[PDB]
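Ticket #4471: structure export looks truncated?
Reporter: QA, pipeline team
Priority: medium

Steps to reproduce: submit the single chain below to the structure queue and open the exported record.
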Amino acid sequence: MGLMSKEQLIILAKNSSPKEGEYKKILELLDEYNLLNNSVEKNSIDLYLKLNELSKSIDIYLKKYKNSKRNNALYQLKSDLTKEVIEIKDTNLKPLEKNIHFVWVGGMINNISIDYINQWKDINSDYETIIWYDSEALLVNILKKAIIDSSNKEVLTKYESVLNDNSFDSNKFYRERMEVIFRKQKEFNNYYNTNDNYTKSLNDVIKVYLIEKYLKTDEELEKYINESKEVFKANGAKDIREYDILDDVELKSIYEQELLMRFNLASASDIIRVIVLNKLGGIYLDVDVLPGIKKHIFKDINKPTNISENKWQMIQLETIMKYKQYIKGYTENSFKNLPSDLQEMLQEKVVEKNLKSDIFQRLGDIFISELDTKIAFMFGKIANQVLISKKNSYSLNLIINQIKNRYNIINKCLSSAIEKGSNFNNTVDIFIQQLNEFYVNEGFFVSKVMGYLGDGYMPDMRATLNISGPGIYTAAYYDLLYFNERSLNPQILQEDLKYFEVPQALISQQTEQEINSSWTFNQVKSQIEYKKLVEKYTNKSLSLEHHH
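Actual output as written to the record:
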């Protein structure tokens, strides 16, 4: 079923007055949509654009004749347009390109990640599995760590005689450290643009800079580079510098601003995964996501009442790995603490299965609309750890426009702030000032991006989420469902988002590497990390008690 017919709307909206010109436009647009929906081609994108026309046509009538008796039928039709978008998205399916995309930029990929990736390769021989990396950025993590470690040492040496004084605390440490980090980020980019270094190979530039200013040896860095490239080539990885991934001059600059001025590798990967999925299609996966476990394996075992569903999945993965050894070295700590009769029931359900494909669910043939882009949910929230989309999808285009618009705003106020700012703290203050003065309409957005310059270095700042992360996907889905562009304050409910969910049957998210990497740089973890930093870099040790 689709939209109401034109004669159906005529009967619902009839009154004694003649048809207004704006009403006739709605009616002919409705006719055009319904004729479009009954054709051989039925192209999802062409149908969506016609709905967008219809939506703008209803808004024109509703604002010109705000008391018309037709408005009740017309508002109903307007509501139906959003429901119709969902129906097109889920019935005009085309086969998904059989690509599995992983992204690892900034350094060497971990060997356990290769093990996880290989589980996906084995189960989906009909898919091409690609590990995307950046051959020019293999030293970025080393540079970032060198910048952070020298800023730790610099601050802790400057305040060593006051670390146990009353005024100095962990929050003062991170504020003073952020000034040093900002300065050092500034130092590198000055070197990056000195003479002709901006046209030399980025990897060579970073290597020389690390030798020159951070006491690295050419031998040890060359070894890291070549050994990482060896792992990548041994697993059929693809360099983004060689497959025209960085075609878009705007997106390339955004990628490299995250890569080289914020050293925010999570954000840099947020960019690349969107670019490769839009260019080639398929499914993107974080390297710590494993295939889904088939529903019927453990169905007859009762989950203990206290144990969460996420911990139940951990136990299932641990059971599989303990008795099938698909990934060697997988933890069994959760399994070991279970009562022995539950261990024995879990073990039996695994040992009775013969094939790895009998336990894990293969991707198989996936059908999806050109309008769609699916996203994983974790704890009821959308997370871009898994994405599914055809190439050049309509929703990926909306997501790309969200990135470009958001970085346009951020960079316009960051450049203003850097010009007017004398240090890190007043640069941030001017940044926030400029954001509020010129985006008075968007206070929800300004609140989410305030801490851009401190993200990853300061406790309780994660602006990235609403610039390159899941926050832009919420906005893009609102753009699609309610016929808007580049919206910064979406009004979309938890129900509308779940029409975009990656089927849970396809993924196991509660893996050992996922849980290890899952963290939150909040106040308490910052205080723990600061406490260890003091003992590492000085001979003092943090008091537990405050002296009166």
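Status: closed, not a bug. The export was complete when the record was re-opened. Leaving a note from the reviewer for reference: Residues 204 and 420 are 33 Å apart (CA to CA).
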